Amino acid sequence: GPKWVKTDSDFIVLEI
Amino acid sequence: EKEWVEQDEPGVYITLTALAGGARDLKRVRFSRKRFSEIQAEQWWADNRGRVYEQYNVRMV
């Protein structure tokens, strides 16, 4: 993307 | 293909890769929800992207 992944309850992830 | 995590600012963890000590790539950035809202994490990336690429020696293509 980069793409944001917001499904986890402990972390936000930016997948580059 | 080595892959590892670096501690950056508190709550920010950066995953890097390299093949056999070759050029490094930025794979992902993980933000603790303890320390970041989603709005804050987006702003953090805008504010820190350039420094992250330089500090961790990833070519900013």
Coordinates of all heavy atoms in Angstrom, one line a residue, unseen atoms left out:
Chain A
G1 N 0.8 -1.2 0.0 CA 0.0 0.0 0.0 C 0.8 1.3 0.0 O 1.0 1.9 -1.1
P2 N 1.4 1.7 1.2 CA 1.2 1.0 2.5 C -0.2 0.8 2.9 O -1.1 1.7 2.5 CB 2.0 1.9 3.4 CG 3.0 2.6 2.5 CD 2.3 2.8 1.2
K3 N -0.5 -0.2 3.7 CA -1.9 -0.5 4.2 C -1.9 -0.5 5.7 O -1.0 -1.1 6.3 CB -2.4 -1.8 3.6 CG -2.5 -1.9 2.1 CD -3.6 -0.9 1.6 CE -3.4 -0.8 0.1 NZ -3.0 -2.0 -0.6
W4 N -2.9 0.1 6.3 CA -3.1 0.0 7.7 C -3.9 -1.3 8.0 O -4.9 -1.5 7.3 CB -3.9 1.2 8.2 CG -3.0 2.5 8.1 CD1 -3.1 3.4 7.1 CD2 -2.0 2.9 9.1 NE1 -2.2 4.4 7.4 CE2 -1.5 4.1 8.6 CE3 -1.5 2.4 10.3 CZ2 -0.5 4.8 9.3 CZ3 -0.5 3.0 10.9 CH2 0.0 4.3 10.4
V5 N -3.5 -2.0 9.0 CA -4.3 -3.2 9.5 C -4.7 -2.8 11.0 O -3.8 -2.6 11.8 CB -3.4 -4.4 9.4 CG1 -4.2 -5.6 10.0 CG2 -3.0 -4.7 8.0
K6 N -6.0 -2.8 11.2 CA -6.5 -2.3 12.5 C -7.3 -3.4 13.2 O -8.1 -3.1 14.1 CB -7.3 -1.1 12.2 CG -6.5 0.1 11.7 CD -7.4 1.3 11.2 CE -6.5 2.4 10.7 NZ -7.4 3.4 10.0
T7 N -7.2 -4.7 12.9 CA -8.0 -5.7 13.4 C -7.4 -6.3 14.7 O -8.2 -7.1 15.4 CB -8.0 -6.9 12.4 OG1 -6.7 -7.2 11.9 CG2 -8.9 -6.5 11.2
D8 N -6.2 -6.0 15.1 CA -5.6 -6.6 16.3 C -5.9 -5.7 17.5 O -6.0 -4.4 17.4 CB -4.1 -6.7 16.2 CG -3.5 -7.5 17.3 OD1 -3.6 -8.8 17.3 OD2 -2.8 -7.0 18.2
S9 N -6.1 -6.3 18.7 CA -6.5 -5.5 19.8 C -5.2 -5.0 20.6 O -5.4 -4.1 21.4 CB -7.3 -6.3 20.8 OG -6.6 -7.4 21.3
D10 N -4.0 -5.4 20.3 CA -2.8 -4.9 20.9 C -2.0 -4.0 20.1 O -1.4 -3.1 20.6 CB -1.9 -6.1 21.3 CG -2.5 -6.9 22.5 OD1 -3.1 -6.3 23.4 OD2 -2.2 -8.1 22.6
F11 N -2.1 -4.1 18.7 CA -1.2 -3.3 17.8 C -2.0 -2.8 16.7 O -2.9 -3.5 16.2 CB 0.0 -4.2 17.3 CG 0.8 -4.7 18.4 CD1 0.8 -6.1 18.7 CD2 1.7 -3.9 19.1 CE1 1.6 -6.6 19.7 CE2 2.5 -4.4 20.1 CZ 2.4 -5.7 20.4
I12 N -1.6 -1.7 16.2 CA -1.9 -1.2 14.8 C -0.7 -1.5 14.0 O 0.4 -1.3 14.4 CB -2.1 0.4 14.9 CG1 -3.3 0.7 15.9 CG2 -2.4 0.9 13.5 CD1 -3.1 2.1 16.4
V13 N -1.0 -2.0 12.8 CA 0.1 -2.4 11.9 C 0.1 -1.6 10.6 O -1.0 -1.4 10.0 CB 0.1 -3.9 11.6 CG1 1.3 -4.2 10.6 CG2 0.2 -4.7 12.9
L14 N 1.2 -1.0 10.2 CA 1.4 -0.4 8.9 C 2.2 -1.4 8.1 O 3.4 -1.6 8.3 CB 2.1 1.0 9.0 CG 2.4 1.7 7.6 CD1 1.1 2.0 7.0 CD2 3.2 2.9 7.9
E15 N 1.6 -2.0 7.1 CA 2.2 -3.0 6.3 C 2.8 -2.3 5.0 O 2.0 -1.8 4.2 CB 1.2 -4.1 5.9 CG 1.8 -5.3 5.3 CD 2.6 -6.2 6.3 OE1 2.4 -6.0 7.5 OE2 3.3 -7.1 5.9
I16 N 4.1 -2.2 4.9 CA 4.7 -1.4 3.9 C 4.6 -2.0 2.5 O 5.0 -3.2 2.4 CB 6.1 -1.0 4.3 CG1 6.1 -0.3 5.6 CG2 6.8 -0.1 3.2 CD1 5.6 1.1 5.6
Chain B
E1 N 17.6 -14.6 4.3 CA 16.9 -13.4 4.4 C 16.6 -13.0 5.9 O 15.6 -13.4 6.4 CB 15.6 -13.5 3.7 CG 14.8 -12.2 3.7 CD 13.4 -12.4 3.0 OE1 13.3 -13.3 2.2 OE2 12.5 -11.5 3.2
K2 N 17.6 -12.3 6.5 CA 17.4 -11.9 7.9 C 16.2 -11.0 8.0 O 16.0 -10.1 7.2 CB 18.7 -11.2 8.4 CG 18.7 -11.1 9.9 CD 20.1 -10.7 10.4 CE 20.1 -9.6 11.4 NZ 19.8 -10.1 12.8
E3 N 15.5 -11.1 9.1 CA 14.3 -10.3 9.4 C 14.3 -10.0 10.9 O 14.5 -11.0 11.7 CB 13.0 -11.0 9.0 CG 11.8 -10.2 9.3 CD 10.5 -10.8 8.7 OE1 10.6 -11.5 7.7 OE2 9.4 -10.6 9.3
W4 N 14.2 -8.8 11.3 CA 14.3 -8.5 12.7 C 13.5 -7.2 13.0 O 13.1 -6.5 12.1 CB 15.8 -8.3 13.2 CG 16.5 -7.1 12.6 CD1 16.7 -5.9 13.3 CD2 17.1 -6.9 11.3 NE1 17.4 -5.0 12.5 CE2 17.6 -5.6 11.3 CE3 17.2 -7.7 10.2 CZ2 18.2 -5.0 10.2 CZ3 17.8 -7.1 9.0 CH2 18.3 -5.8 9.0
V5 N 13.4 -7.0 14.3 CA 12.6 -5.8 14.8 C 13.5 -4.9 15.6 O 14.3 -5.3 16.4 CB 11.4 -6.3 15.7 CG1 10.7 -5.1 16.3 CG2 10.5 -7.2 14.9
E6 N 13.3 -3.6 15.4 CA 14.0 -2.6 16.1 C 13.0 -1.8 17.0 O 12.0 -1.4 16.5 CB 14.6 -1.5 15.2 CG 15.7 -2.1 14.2 CD 17.0 -2.3 14.9 OE1 17.2 -1.9 16.0 OE2 17.9 -2.7 14.2
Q7 N 13.5 -1.5 18.2 CA 12.8 -0.6 19.1 C 13.0 0.8 18.6 O 14.2 1.3 18.5 CB 13.4 -0.7 20.5 CG 13.0 0.4 21.4 CD 11.6 0.1 22.0 OE1 11.3 -0.9 22.7 NE2 10.6 1.0 21.7
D8 N 12.0 1.6 18.3 CA 12.1 3.0 17.9 C 11.6 3.8 19.1 O 11.9 3.5 20.2 CB 11.4 3.2 16.6 CG 11.8 4.6 16.0 OD1 13.0 4.7 15.6 OD2 11.0 5.5 16.0
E9 N 10.8 4.8 18.9 CA 10.2 5.6 20.0 C 9.3 4.6 20.8 O 8.9 3.5 20.3 CB 9.3 6.7 19.4 CG 10.1 7.8 18.7 CD 9.4 8.9 18.2 OE1 8.1 9.0 18.5 OE2 10.0 9.8 17.5
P10 N 9.0 4.9 22.1 CA 8.2 4.0 22.9 C 6.9 3.7 22.2 O 6.2 4.5 21.6 CB 7.9 4.9 24.2 CG 9.2 5.7 24.3 CD 9.4 6.1 22.9
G11 N 6.6 2.4 22.1 CA 5.4 1.9 21.4 C 5.5 1.7 19.9 O 4.5 1.4 19.3
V12 N 6.7 1.9 19.4 CA 6.9 1.8 17.9 C 8.0 0.8 17.6 O 9.1 0.9 18.1 CB 7.3 3.2 17.3 CG1 7.4 3.0 15.7 CG2 6.3 4.3 17.7
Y13 N 7.6 -0.2 16.9 CA 8.5 -1.4 16.6 C 8.6 -1.6 15.1 O 7.6 -1.7 14.4 CB 8.0 -2.6 17.3 CG 7.6 -2.3 18.7 CD1 6.3 -2.1 19.1 CD2 8.6 -2.1 19.7 CE1 5.9 -1.7 20.4 CE2 8.3 -1.7 21.0 CZ 6.9 -1.5 21.3 OH 6.6 -1.1 22.6
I14 N 9.8 -1.5 14.6 CA 10.0 -1.5 13.1 C 10.6 -2.8 12.6 O 11.7 -3.2 13.1 CB 10.9 -0.3 12.8 CG1 10.2 1.0 13.2 CG2 11.3 -0.3 11.3 CD1 11.0 2.2 13.1
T15 N 10.0 -3.4 11.7 CA 10.5 -4.7 11.1 C 11.3 -4.4 9.8 O 10.8 -3.8 8.9 CB 9.4 -5.7 10.8 OG1 8.7 -5.9 12.0 CG2 10.0 -7.0 10.3
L16 N 12.6 -4.9 9.8 CA 13.5 -4.7 8.7 C 13.9 -6.1 8.2 O 13.8 -7.1 8.9 CB 14.8 -4.0 9.2 CG 14.5 -2.6 9.8 CD1 15.8 -2.1 10.4 CD2 14.0 -1.6 8.7
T17 N 14.2 -6.1 6.9 CA 14.8 -7.3 6.3 C 16.0 -6.9 5.5 O 16.2 -5.8 5.0 CB 13.8 -8.0 5.3 OG1 13.5 -7.1 4.3 CG2 12.6 -8.4 6.1
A18 N 16.9 -8.0 5.3 CA 18.0 -7.9 4.4 C 18.4 -9.3 4.0 O 18.2 -10.3 4.8 CB 19.2 -7.3 5.2
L19 N 18.8 -9.5 2.8 CA 19.3 -10.8 2.3 C 20.8 -10.8 2.4 O 21.5 -10.0 1.7 CB 18.9 -11.1 0.9 CG 19.4 -12.4 0.3 CD1 18.6 -13.6 0.7 CD2 19.5 -12.3 -1.2
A20 N 21.4 -11.7 3.2 CA 22.8 -11.9 3.2 C 23.6 -10.6 3.4 O 24.7 -10.4 2.7 CB 23.3 -12.7 2.0
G21 N 23.1 -9.8 4.2 CA 23.8 -8.5 4.4 C 23.7 -7.5 3.3 O 24.5 -6.6 3.1
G22 N 22.7 -7.7 2.4 CA 22.5 -6.8 1.3 C 21.7 -5.6 1.7 O 21.6 -5.2 2.9
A23 N 21.1 -4.9 0.7 CA 20.3 -3.7 1.0 C 19.1 -4.0 1.9 O 18.4 -5.1 1.7 CB 19.8 -3.1 -0.3
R24 N 18.8 -3.2 2.9 CA 17.7 -3.4 3.8 C 16.4 -2.9 3.2 O 16.3 -1.9 2.4 CB 17.9 -2.6 5.0 CG 19.1 -3.0 5.8 CD 19.3 -2.1 7.0 NE 20.2 -2.7 8.0 CZ 20.4 -2.2 9.2 NH1 19.7 -1.2 9.6 NH2 21.3 -2.7 10.0
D25 N 15.3 -3.5 3.6 CA 13.9 -3.2 3.3 C 13.1 -3.0 4.6 O 13.4 -3.6 5.6 CB 13.3 -4.2 2.4 CG 12.0 -3.7 1.8 OD1 11.9 -2.5 1.5 OD2 11.1 -4.6 1.5
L26 N 12.2 -2.1 4.5 CA 11.2 -1.8 5.6 C 10.0 -2.7 5.4 O 9.3 -2.5 4.3 CB 10.9 -0.3 5.6 CG 9.8 0.1 6.6 CD1 10.3 -0.2 8.0 CD2 9.6 1.6 6.5
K27 N 9.7 -3.6 6.3 CA 8.6 -4.5 6.1 C 7.3 -4.0 6.7 O 6.2 -4.1 6.1 CB 8.9 -5.9 6.7 CG 7.9 -6.9 6.4 CD 8.4 -8.3 6.5 CE 7.5 -9.3 5.9 NZ 8.0 -10.7 6.2
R28 N 7.4 -3.5 7.9 CA 6.2 -3.0 8.6 C 6.6 -2.2 9.8 O 7.7 -2.3 10.3 CB 5.2 -4.2 9.1 CG 5.8 -5.1 10.1 CD 4.8 -6.2 10.5 NE 4.4 -7.0 9.3 CZ 5.0 -8.2 9.0 NH1 6.0 -8.6 9.7 NH2 4.6 -8.8 7.9
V29 N 5.6 -1.4 10.3 CA 5.8 -0.7 11.6 C 4.6 -1.1 12.4 O 3.4 -1.1 12.0 CB 5.8 0.8 11.3 CG1 6.0 1.6 12.7 CG2 6.9 1.2 10.3
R30 N 4.9 -1.5 13.7 CA 3.8 -1.9 14.6 C 3.8 -0.9 15.7 O 4.8 -0.5 16.3 CB 4.1 -3.3 15.2 CG 3.8 -4.4 14.2 CD 3.0 -5.6 14.7 NE 3.8 -6.4 15.6 CZ 3.3 -7.5 16.3 NH1 2.1 -7.8 16.3 NH2 4.2 -8.1 17.1
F31 N 2.5 -0.4 16.0 CA 2.3 0.6 17.0 C 1.5 0.0 18.2 O 0.4 -0.6 17.9 CB 1.5 1.8 16.5 CG 2.1 2.5 15.3 CD1 2.0 2.1 14.0 CD2 2.8 3.7 15.6 CE1 2.5 2.8 13.0 CE2 3.4 4.4 14.5 CZ 3.3 3.9 13.2
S32 N 2.0 0.1 19.4 CA 1.2 -0.4 20.5 C -0.1 0.5 20.7 O 0.0 1.7 20.7 CB 2.1 -0.3 21.8 OG 1.4 -0.6 22.9
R33 N -1.2 -0.2 20.9 CA -2.4 0.5 21.2 C -2.4 1.1 22.6 O -3.2 2.0 23.0 CB -3.6 -0.4 21.1 CG -3.8 -0.7 19.6 CD -5.2 -1.3 19.4 NE -5.5 -1.9 18.1 CZ -6.1 -1.2 17.1 NH1 -6.4 0.1 17.3 NH2 -6.5 -1.9 16.1
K34 N -1.4 0.6 23.5 CA -1.3 1.3 24.8 C -0.9 2.7 24.6 O -1.3 3.6 25.3 CB -0.2 0.5 25.6 CG 0.2 1.1 26.9 CD 1.1 0.2 27.6 CE 1.6 0.9 28.9 NZ 2.5 0.0 29.6
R35 N 0.0 3.0 23.6 CA 0.6 4.3 23.3 C 0.0 5.1 22.2 O 0.2 6.3 22.1 CB 2.1 4.2 23.2 CG 2.7 3.7 24.5 CD 4.3 3.6 24.5 NE 4.8 3.7 25.9 CZ 5.0 2.7 26.6 NH1 4.7 1.4 26.2 NH2 5.5 2.8 27.9
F36 N -0.7 4.5 21.3 CA -1.2 5.1 20.0 C -2.7 4.9 19.8 O -3.1 3.7 19.7 CB -0.4 4.6 18.8 CG 1.0 5.1 18.8 CD1 2.0 4.5 19.4 CD2 1.3 6.3 18.1 CE1 3.3 5.0 19.4 CE2 2.6 6.8 18.1 CZ 3.6 6.2 18.8
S37 N -3.4 5.9 19.5 CA -4.7 5.8 18.8 C -4.4 5.6 17.3 O -3.3 5.8 16.8 CB -5.5 7.1 19.0 OG -4.9 8.2 18.3
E38 N -5.4 5.3 16.5 CA -5.2 5.1 15.1 C -4.9 6.5 14.4 O -4.0 6.5 13.5 CB -6.4 4.4 14.5 CG -6.5 3.0 14.9 CD -7.8 2.3 14.7 OE1 -8.7 2.9 14.0 OE2 -8.0 1.1 15.1
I39 N -5.5 7.6 14.9 CA -5.2 8.9 14.4 C -3.8 9.3 14.7 O -3.0 9.8 13.8 CB -6.2 9.9 14.9 CG1 -7.6 9.7 14.3 CG2 -5.7 11.3 14.7 CD1 -8.7 10.6 14.9
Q40 N -3.3 9.0 15.9 CA -2.0 9.3 16.3 C -1.0 8.5 15.5 O 0.1 9.0 15.1 CB -1.8 9.0 17.8 CG -2.3 10.0 18.7 CD -2.2 9.6 20.2 OE1 -2.5 8.4 20.5 NE2 -1.7 10.5 21.0
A41 N -1.2 7.2 15.2 CA -0.3 6.4 14.5 C -0.1 6.9 13.0 O 1.0 7.0 12.5 CB -0.7 4.9 14.4
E42 N -1.3 7.3 12.4 CA -1.2 7.9 11.1 C -0.4 9.2 11.1 O 0.5 9.4 10.2 CB -2.6 8.1 10.5 CG -3.3 6.8 10.3 CD -4.5 6.9 9.4 OE1 -4.5 7.6 8.4 OE2 -5.5 6.2 9.8
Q43 N -0.6 10.0 12.1 CA 0.2 11.3 12.2 C 1.7 11.0 12.4 O 2.5 11.6 11.8 CB -0.4 12.2 13.3 CG 0.3 13.6 13.3 CD 0.0 14.4 12.1 OE1 -1.2 14.6 11.7 NE2 1.1 14.8 11.4
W44 N 1.9 10.0 13.2 CA 3.3 9.6 13.5 C 4.1 9.2 12.3 O 5.2 9.6 12.0 CB 3.4 8.4 14.5 CG 4.7 8.2 15.1 CD1 5.2 8.6 16.2 CD2 5.8 7.4 14.5 NE1 6.5 8.2 16.4 CE2 6.9 7.4 15.3 CE3 5.9 6.6 13.3 CZ2 8.1 6.8 15.1 CZ3 7.1 6.0 13.0 CH2 8.2 6.1 13.9
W45 N 3.4 8.4 11.4 CA 4.1 8.0 10.2 C 4.3 9.2 9.3 O 5.4 9.3 8.7 CB 3.2 6.9 9.5 CG 3.9 6.4 8.3 CD1 3.4 6.5 7.0 CD2 5.2 5.8 8.2 NE1 4.3 5.9 6.1 CE2 5.4 5.4 6.9 CE3 6.2 5.4 9.2 CZ2 6.6 4.8 6.4 CZ3 7.3 4.8 8.7 CH2 7.5 4.5 7.4
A46 N 3.4 10.1 9.2 CA 3.6 11.3 8.4 C 4.8 12.1 8.9 O 5.7 12.6 8.2 CB 2.4 12.2 8.4
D47 N 4.9 12.2 10.2 CA 6.0 13.0 10.9 C 7.3 12.3 10.9 O 8.4 13.0 11.0 CB 5.6 13.3 12.3 CG 4.5 14.2 12.5 OD1 4.1 14.9 11.5 OD2 3.9 14.3 13.6
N48 N 7.4 11.0 10.8 CA 8.6 10.3 11.1 C 9.1 9.4 9.9 O 10.3 8.9 10.0 CB 8.4 9.3 12.3 CG 8.4 10.1 13.6 OD1 9.5 10.3 14.2 ND2 7.2 10.5 14.1
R49 N 8.4 9.3 8.8 CA 8.8 8.5 7.7 C 10.2 8.7 7.2 O 11.0 7.8 7.0 CB 7.7 8.6 6.6 CG 8.1 8.0 5.2 CD 7.1 8.1 4.1 NE 7.4 7.4 2.9 CZ 8.1 8.0 1.9 NH1 8.5 9.2 2.0 NH2 8.4 7.3 0.8
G50 N 10.5 10.0 7.0 CA 11.8 10.3 6.4 C 12.9 9.9 7.4 O 13.9 9.3 6.9
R51 N 12.8 10.2 8.7 CA 13.8 9.8 9.6 C 13.9 8.3 9.7 O 15.0 7.8 9.8 CB 13.4 10.4 11.0 CG 14.5 10.5 12.0 CD 14.4 9.4 13.0 NE 13.1 9.3 13.6 CZ 12.7 8.2 14.2 NH1 13.5 7.2 14.4 NH2 11.4 8.0 14.7
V52 N 12.8 7.6 9.7 CA 12.9 6.1 9.8 C 13.7 5.5 8.6 O 14.6 4.7 8.8 CB 11.5 5.5 9.8 CG1 11.5 4.0 9.6 CG2 10.9 5.8 11.2
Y53 N 13.4 6.0 7.4 CA 14.2 5.5 6.3 C 15.7 5.8 6.4 O 16.5 5.0 6.1 CB 13.7 6.0 4.9 CG 12.5 5.3 4.4 CD1 11.2 5.6 4.8 CD2 12.6 4.2 3.6 CE1 10.1 4.9 4.4 CE2 11.5 3.5 3.1 CZ 10.3 3.8 3.5 OH 9.2 3.1 3.1
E54 N 16.0 7.0 6.8 CA 17.4 7.4 6.9 C 18.1 6.6 8.1 O 19.2 6.1 7.9 CB 17.6 8.9 7.1 CG 19.1 9.3 7.0 CD 19.4 10.7 7.5 OE1 19.6 10.9 8.7 OE2 19.3 11.7 6.7
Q55 N 17.5 6.6 9.3 CA 18.1 6.1 10.4 C 18.4 4.6 10.3 O 19.5 4.1 10.7 CB 17.2 6.3 11.7 CG 17.8 5.7 12.9 CD 17.0 6.1 14.2 OE1 16.4 7.1 14.2 NE2 17.1 5.2 15.2
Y56 N 17.5 3.9 9.7 CA 17.6 2.4 9.5 C 18.2 2.0 8.2 O 18.2 0.8 7.9 CB 16.2 1.8 9.8 CG 15.8 2.0 11.3 CD1 14.8 2.9 11.5 CD2 16.4 1.4 12.3 CE1 14.4 3.2 12.9 CE2 16.1 1.7 13.6 CZ 15.1 2.5 13.9 OH 14.8 2.8 15.2
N57 N 18.6 3.0 7.4 CA 19.4 2.7 6.2 C 18.5 1.9 5.2 O 19.0 0.9 4.6 CB 20.7 2.1 6.5 CG 21.6 2.1 5.3 OD1 21.5 3.0 4.4 ND2 22.6 1.2 5.2
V58 N 17.3 2.4 4.9 CA 16.5 1.8 3.9 C 16.3 2.9 2.8 O 16.0 4.0 3.1 CB 15.1 1.5 4.4 CG1 14.2 1.0 3.3 CG2 15.2 0.4 5.6
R59 N 16.6 2.6 1.6 CA 16.5 3.6 0.5 C 15.0 3.9 0.4 O 14.1 3.1 0.3 CB 17.0 3.0 -0.8
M60 N 14.7 5.3 0.4 CA 13.4 5.8 0.3 C 13.1 6.0 -1.2 O 13.3 7.0 -1.7 CB 13.2 7.0 1.1 CG 11.8 7.4 1.5 SD 11.7 8.6 2.9 CE 12.4 10.0 2.0
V61 N 12.6 4.9 -1.8 CA 12.3 5.0 -3.2 C 11.1 5.8 -3.6 O 10.2 6.0 -2.7 CB 12.1 3.5 -3.8 CG1 11.8 3.6 -5.3 CG2 13.4 2.7 -3.6

